[PDB]
Amino acid sequence: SVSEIQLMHNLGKHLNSMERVEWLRKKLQDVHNFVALGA
Numbered sequence: 001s002v003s004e005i006q007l008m009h010n011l012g013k014h015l016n017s018m019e020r021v022e023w024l025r026k027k028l029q030d031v032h033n034f035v036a037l038g039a
Contacts, residue, residue, distance in 0.1 A: 007014045015023050032039060 004017070007016055007019070010019060012019050012022065028039065
């Protein structure tokens with residue numbers, strides 16, 4: 001059985017498990033170069 005087959009096929013269009021964490025990882029770089037370069 002295969003669960004979330006379309007979720008993995010979206011890889012960025014759905015944003016839930018591995019897609020969401022990738023969006024948050026980029027957000028850490030945006031916050032880093034937003035007001036102060038800390039993290």
